[PDB]
Amino acid sequence: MFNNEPLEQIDKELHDILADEEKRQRETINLIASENLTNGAVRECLGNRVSNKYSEGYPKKRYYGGNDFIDKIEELCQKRALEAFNVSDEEWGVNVQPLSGSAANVQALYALVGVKGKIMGMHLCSGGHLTHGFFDEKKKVSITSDMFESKLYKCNSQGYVDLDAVREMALSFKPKVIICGYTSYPRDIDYQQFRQICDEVNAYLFADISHISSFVACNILNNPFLHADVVTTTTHKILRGPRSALIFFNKKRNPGIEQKINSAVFPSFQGGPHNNKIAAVACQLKEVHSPAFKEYTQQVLLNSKALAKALISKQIDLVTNGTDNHLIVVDLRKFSITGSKLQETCNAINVSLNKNTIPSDVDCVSPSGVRIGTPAMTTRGAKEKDMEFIADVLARAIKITVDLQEQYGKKLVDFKKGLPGNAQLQQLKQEVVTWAGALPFP
Amino acid sequence: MFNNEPLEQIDKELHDILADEEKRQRETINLIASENLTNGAVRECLGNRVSNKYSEGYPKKRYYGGNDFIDKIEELCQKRALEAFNVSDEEWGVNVQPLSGSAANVQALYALVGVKGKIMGMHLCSGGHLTHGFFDEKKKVSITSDMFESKLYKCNSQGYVDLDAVREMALSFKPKVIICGYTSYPRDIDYQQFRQICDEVNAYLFADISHISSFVACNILNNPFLHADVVTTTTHKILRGPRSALIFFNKKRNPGIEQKINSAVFPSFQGGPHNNKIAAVACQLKEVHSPAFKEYTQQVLLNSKALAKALISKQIDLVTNGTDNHLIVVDLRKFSITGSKLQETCNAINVSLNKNTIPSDVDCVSPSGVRIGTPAMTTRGAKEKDMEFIADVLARAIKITVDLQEQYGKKLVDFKKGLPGNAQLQQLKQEVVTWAGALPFP
Ligand SMILES: *Cc1c(COP(=O)(O)O)cnc(C)c1O
Ligand SMILES: *Cc1c(COP(=O)(O)O)cnc(C)c1O
């Protein structure tokens, strides 16, 4: 007693929009540093019947029965998680149930400090995440500043973490948790010098490596697992998994932490795990451990290096003047345009990127930069030689943005009206669509 | 630069477990009242490439661009949502982003009351959900008792919501939110009477209709939308959608509540939405509003009535001596066995049900009942005539549990040793598998 008709039949209208979205994805140069494209296998798992099953609790300790094949899956996922990140059963545990990077952070932070607890994180405009305790002056924008009492540190004017300001603010504030690892940081992190600050004040060290997880896994960047009490990471983004998250916790450094994290996730916050998510994570953490994935991660970094260099060779400025990772923040002050306007121009040419603050920005409104990243295009098979074209496309986009701003004004509302119809944009778009359209697409 | 090989090939190990789980689901009489089986179309959406896309924010008001087709999906889903539950655009709003029923309740409650806010809900052992403010004498088990100040009401010894106890507790405690709608309540709810209690205290009325959502949509049970300020429902369970949740809010009764709910979800709690979830919710809500779905919901109620009746006809006691909905709680005291034990016996015979407390249980350990429901089996095509067999199977399961208990003792560990290699159970299991196995299976 159900309708078994395929999606095309059963809901034509939704099948059409979904087909368009796929075409868009396929025909776009995607530079969103936090996006990627999952393979077909991951998507078979996300659509598996395993999500019919309710599984509140943990393996061997479920509320309900019938959970034997489910337990093997969660078990496999924890196994594959701890090894991908080169840690041992006996030092580190992992929770694979958090539904999102934001959930994992909220849960992990609750487990460590509880309500009213004190936390330190990097400011949003400076490149920290919302769930790192973000607030405005007026109101607590993130639960992490309301459930918790949070203070925010900034980066210096060169766009580097001001470790000395981290110490100044910590000693005065005495947080129980200091969060590092960011949303928009083009340089690797000094986890050791964070480990020293926490130790100095008896704080937990929290590394959110969501943006760079693959570099940590692949031994290409610094290892927070030698210094952190807790590491969180999304499974999507550069890891190229489904939409989910992982909480790692150092048993050796804090016995009794395993209980605090496992019970914070459920029953404090979540209900039943989403087992399709867990299956898909398992499926990608296998891939993550294969040496072809290390190749891919290396290709990501090469492309990023090549992208930065090509942009510099076209006299475009980058925050910190380069990158150690997959992402580049462009400083646009030189051209008297906002990242705000450039996003609009690139949207108009099937190029995906987003506005981003730069150190000199006092507010988060009308920011002076854009963030770009190479994980998605690398997945699509672009190599170092392809970065010049992307850089070329971006420079042309910056130039057209300058031309349209002089013709239509600095007012963002007014700027947009210039975009539609523009022959330069249409030609550049078609250039993009023609190159993007035919690239490998999972 | 990715692996395109199918799941069977790319990860044989996971594929075999998943295949086993599909066979378990198929060969089980599944009476878990909160479970169902999604159709293929819902599962094409869960594995759609739409989940590649980051969509922080709401339609027309996203952080990033490239979001036109995503915006059309979220808008469709909210539209199909508001009509399914027969409410007008102009009186009711919905948020389709919450990832789980539990997140919806945490997010919805935070929007209404804020940290330290006062809430009232039904106790867990009485059938209220964890996210209704559950705590123990020792621990704040759910975030909803720690983040908020919560008080828990109970049902009377007949298993009915004790409205007089609700008013009492509400006047003494003055909450800002009173939650009703439950996890394990076999009867319909008097929302008008809750609405009156909330008015005398100026509290919000919160209806979590996750278990009975389809009865509300199809106009078979009472309509909470006539009285409630806020209604939450999972999209899974009886609604038979994917794993996700909805928050409905009454604009007409509460000005400026729309932004309170929309902002608590994001950016207070969640990050990007999971667009595959929103897609799938849209696809099922289309179904919900179709006349075939009302038929199904009617078959669910018919089946429950027949199962209740056939259980009574075999001298088995039911809490409230029947049901108005999809679920029955069996009282086992008459047989001197625990729900705990019966769950084990039914596990051993491919029958899924769960232990449940009854009013006379003061412990939530070693409870005296079991909860059963008809949504999953109705989906699989069982009709009223088939409930006899299921009642017959449960009666026989109770008897074997009786026999095994006095042969092995009343201690849980001792009891379980009797299950393996018991000829009666293997025979009964065989009968179950044979009947379940050939039933229609999405
Ligand atoms: C993207 C991100 C998150 C949140 O991930 P979601 O799954 O989108 O909630 C958390 N922390 C960091 C550093 C991130 O980059
Ligand atoms: C099952 C349930 C929930 C939570 O649903 P999840 O998706 O498992 O978080 C919330 N409220 C009620 C009444 C429920 O039955």
- Count of residues for chain B? 442
**Residue-wise DSSP of A267-278:** III--S--HHHH
Q: What does the alpha-carbon distance between residue A54 and residue A266 come to, in Å, rounded to a whole number?
A: 13
Say whether A24 is catalytic: no
Q: B237 an active-site residue?
A: yes
Which residues of chain B does A50 touch, with a Cβ-Cβ cutoff of 8 Å? 18, 21
Pairing of strands B354-356, A230-234: unpaired
> For residue B68, how many other CB atoms are within 10 A of its CB?
15
State the amino acid at position A362 in one-letter form: V
Q: Which residues of B touch A21 (CB under 8 A)?
A: 49-50, 53, 69-70, 73
| Interior/surface letters A127-164, b for 16+ CB within 10 angstroms, e for the rest | bbbbbbbbbeeeebbbbbbbbbbbbbbbbeeebebbbe
Q: Is-catalytic flag, B11? A: no
Q: What is the DSSP letter of B334?
A: G
Cβ A195 vs Cβ A224: under 8 Å: no
Question: Does A381 reach chain B within 8 Å, measured CB to CB?
Answer: yes
Cis link prior to B59 (omega < 30° from 0)? no
CATH number at residue A285: 3.40.640.10
Q: Is the minimum CB–CB distance between B372 and chain A shorter than 8 Å?
A: no
Distance from CA of A415 to the nearest CA of B (A): 16
Instruction: Kindly state whether residue B2 falls inside one of the protein's structural domains.
Output: no
Question: Best of A107, A119, A134, A183 to mutate for ligand 1, by most ligand atoms within 8 A of CB?
Answer: A183
Indicate whether residue B322 lines ligand 1 (CB < 6 A). no
Phi and psi at B396, nearest 5°, equal -65, -35
Residue B3: inside a domain, yes or no?
Answer: no
Are A237 and A210 a contacting pair, CB within 8 Å?
yes
In a domain, A96, yes or no: yes
A265 CA to centre of ligand 2 in angstroms? 15
Give, in order, the Cα–Cα distances in Å from A409 to each of A54, A340, A341, A395, A401. 56, 14, 11, 20, 11
| Long-range interactions of B123-126: CB distance < 8 A, separation 24+ | B123/B152, B123/B153, B123/B154, B124/B152, B124/B364, B125/B357, B125/B361, B125/B363, B125/B364, B125/B367, B126/B152, B126/B153, B126/B154, B126/B155, B126/B357, B126/B359
Pick the residue of A14, A15, A72, A210 with the most B CBs within 10 A to test the interface with B by mutation: A14
Q: Do A267 and B17 count as a contact with CB atoms less than 8 A apart?
A: no
Q: Please provide residue B41's backbone torsions phi and psi, each rounded to the nearest 5 degrees.
A: -65, -40
Contact B106, B119 (CB under 8 A): no
Min Cα–Cα distance to chain A from B359, Å = 20
Residue from B129, B131, B124, B125 nearest B145 by CA: B131
- CB neighbours of residue A199 within 10 Å: 11
Q: Which residues contact A390 (CB under 8 A, 6 or more apart)?
A: A29, A31, A307, A310, A377, A382
Name the strands in the sheet holding B177-180, side by side, starting at the edge strand that comes first in the sequence. Answer: B92-95, B245-250, B230-234, B204-208, B177-180, B118-122, B149-153
Q: Does B280 lie in the same domain as B370?
A: no
Q: Are B150 and B133 in contact (CB under 8 A)?
A: yes
Residue where a domain stops, chosen among B263, B279, B298: B298
Cβ atoms within 10 Å of A313's Cβ, excluding its own: 11
Query: Is A208 annotated in the active site?
Result: yes
Query: A421 and chain B: CB distance < 8 Å anywhere?
Result: no
- Say if the Cβ atoms of B48 and A50 lie within 8 Å: no
Q: Is the CB of B210 under 6 A from ligand 2?
A: yes
Contact of A267 with chain B, judged by CB distance below 8 Å, is answered with yes
SS3 state of residue A398: helix
Asked whether residue A5 is assigned to any structural domain, the reply reads: no
Beta bridge partners of A253: none
End-to-end CA distance of chain B: 35
- Strands B57-58, B230-234: pairing is unpaired
Give the number of other CB atoms < 10 A from CB of residue A361.
Answer: 18
Binding site: which residues of A? 54, 100-102, 129, 183, 211, 236, 243, 272
Is residue A84 domain-shared with residue A161, that is, in the same domain?
yes
| CB-based contact A343:A330 (threshold 8 Å) | no
DSSP string, B198-244: HHTTT-EEEEE-TTTHHHHHTTSS--GGGT-SEEEEESSGGG---S-
- From B14, B76, B379, residue closest to A1, measured CB to CB: B379
Which amino acid is it at A220?
Answer: I
Residues B114 and B144 in one domain: yes
Ligand 2: distance of its center to the CA of B255 in Å?
27
Q: Which of A34, A35, A102 to mutate to test the pocket of ligand 1 (most atoms within 8 A of CB)?
A: A102
Q: What angle do CA B44, B233, B50 make, to 5 degrees?
A: 25
- Ramachandran assignment for A245, one of left (phi > 0), alpha (psi -120 to 50 degrees), beta (any other): beta
| A307 and A412 in a common domain | yes
DSSP-derived 3-state class of residue A410: coil
Q: Is A188 left (phi over 0), alpha (psi -120 to 50) or beta?
A: beta
Question: Token match 């540093």: residue?
Answer: A33
Structure tokens at A405: 């701003």
Angle, alpha carbons B143-B359-B185 (nearest 5°): 65
CA distance B77 to chain A (A): 10
Look at residue A58 and give its three-state secondary structure: strand
CA separation for the pair A389, B196 (Å, rounded): 67
- Within 8 A by CB and 6+ apart from B410, the residues are none
Same domain, A360 and A385: yes
**CA–CA min distance B196, chain A (Å):** 31
B293 and B437 within one domain? no
Strands B118-122 and B92-95: unpaired
Q: Report the distance separating Cα B368 and Cα B331, nearest Å.
A: 6
Spatial strand order in the sheet of A92-95: A92-95, A245-250, A230-234, A204-208, A177-180, A118-122, A149-153
Least CB–CB distance from B130: residue in A28, A267, A296: A267
Closest approach atom of ligand 1 to CA A128: 13
- Taking the CA atoms of chain B, what radius of gyration do you get in angstroms? 22
Residue A237 known to be catalytic: yes
Do B330 and B426 have their domain in common? yes
Q: What angle do CA B296, B300, B304 make, to 5 degrees?
A: 165
With residue B267 as reference, give the H or E element that holds it.
none
- State whether A18 and A91 are in the same domain: no
What's the rounded Cα separation, in Å, for the pair A150 and A136? 11
- Residue A1 inside a domain? The answer is no
Task: Choose among B266, B214, B286, B224: nearest CA to B99.
Answer: B266
Q: Is A352 on the interface with B (CB under 8 A)?
A: yes
**What is the per-residue DSSP string for B408-429?**
H-SSHHHHHHTSTT-HHHHHHH
| B413 close to A (CB below 8 A) | no
End-to-end Cα distance, chain A: 35
Which one of the ligands is nearest to B326 CA? 2
User: What dihedral do alpha carbons A344, A350, A354, A358 form, nearest 10°?
Assistant: -80
Q: Is B283 exposed, middle or buried (0-12, 13-18, 19+ CB in 10 A)?
A: buried
Contact B21 A70 (CB under 8 A): yes
Query: What Cα–Cα distance (Å) separates residue B358 from each residue in A5, B159, B160, B372, B391?
Result: 42, 7, 11, 13, 20
Q: Please choose, from the candidates A187, A194, A190, A195, the residue with its C-alpha nearest in 3D space to the C-alpha of residue A212.
A: A187
Which neighbouring-strand residues pair with B150? Answer: B119
**Could you tell me the two tokens for A264?**
């914070």
- Supply the DSSP string of A152-173, one letter for each residue: EE-B-TTSSB-HHHHHHHHHHH
Are residues A48 and B18 in contact, defined by beta-carbon separation less than 8 angstroms?
Answer: yes
B54 is a domain residue: yes
Pairing mode of beta strands A177-180, A118-122:
parallel
Q: Which-ligand-closest: CA of B237?
A: 2
Q: Who contacts B371 (Cβ-Cβ below 8 Å, separation ≥6)?
A: B33, B184, B327, B328, B329, B330, B353, B354, B355, B356
- B363 falls within a domain: yes
What is the DSSP secondary structure assignment for residue B159, as one 8-state letter? Answer: S
Give the C-alpha separation, A153 to A122, whole Å.
5
Within a domain: residue A4? Answer: no
Residue B398 contacts A where some CB pair is shorter than 8 Å = no
User: Among A298, A315, A347, where does a domain finish?
Assistant: A298
Which of B279, B298, B317 represents a domain boundary (last residue)? B298
- In this structure, are A257 and A117 located in the same domain? yes
CB–CB contact B37 A378 (8 Å): no
DSSP A32-44: -TT-----HHHHH
A231/A249 Cα distance (integer angstroms): 7
Q: Does residue A15 share a domain with residue A50?
A: no
A404 and A374 fall within a common domain: yes
Q: Which atom of ligand 2 is the closest one to the Cα of B237?
A: 1
Query: Could you tell me the residue range of the domain that residue A387 belongs to?
Result: 11-35+299-442
State whether A227 and A321 are in the same domain: no
DSSP per-residue letters across B18-51:
HHHHHHHHHTSEE--TT-----HHHHHHHTSGGG
Residue A188, Cβ density class (10 Å: 0-12 exposed, 13-18 middle, ≥19 buried): middle
| Distance from the Cα of residue B442 to its chain's centroid | 20
Q: Between the CA of residue B208 and those of B128, B130, B261, B319, B330, what are the distances in Å?
A: 10, 12, 15, 21, 23
Q: Is B208 in the pocket of ligand 2 (CB under 6 A)?
A: yes
Cβ–Cβ < 8 Å for A90, A266: no
Give the closest of B14, B38, B110 to A279, CB-based: B14
| Number of domain units in chain B | 2
CATH number, domain of B394, equals 3.90.1150.10
